[PDB]
Amino acid sequence: LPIDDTVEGITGNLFEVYLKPYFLEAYRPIRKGDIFLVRGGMRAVEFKVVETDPSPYC
Amino acid sequence: IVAPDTVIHCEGEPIKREDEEESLNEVGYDDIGGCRKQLAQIKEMVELPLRHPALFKA
């Protein structure tokens, strides 16, 4: 989920613009409870991993 | 289109304006001469932040 004070000015869809090249080819191990940061597009925005179905190490 | 055949009536009292109407009390860009480069620079600095505050905030 996005966080409000970093999306006060940006709008539209953030999925293909930010999140799709972020997890591409890097094989990033994420966990329920972490907050990462994505730069690009004249703005840096953060995302908190809210809910994952499997075990937290994945 | 105003034709020369069309008669022009000027009968009536000098009336006041609507309150939202502007006048020559304020000054526009035409009343300034000889400093086109500096006026261009001030337009570049000032217009784009003030005309579009939400866009420039984004």
CSV table of N, CA and C in Angstrom, one decimal, chain A residues 8 43, chain B residues 57-58:
chain,number,residue,atom,x,y,z
A,8,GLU,N,1.0,12.9,-2.0
A,8,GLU,CA,0.2,14.1,-2.0
A,8,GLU,C,0.1,14.8,-3.3
A,43,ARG,N,10.6,12.1,-8.3
A,43,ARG,CA,9.9,11.8,-7.0
A,43,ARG,C,10.4,10.5,-6.5
B,57,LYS,N,3.8,21.5,-7.7
B,57,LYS,CA,4.0,20.7,-6.5
B,57,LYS,C,4.1,19.2,-6.7
B,58,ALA,N,3.4,18.7,-7.7
B,58,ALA,CA,3.6,17.4,-8.2
B,58,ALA,C,4.9,17.1,-8.9
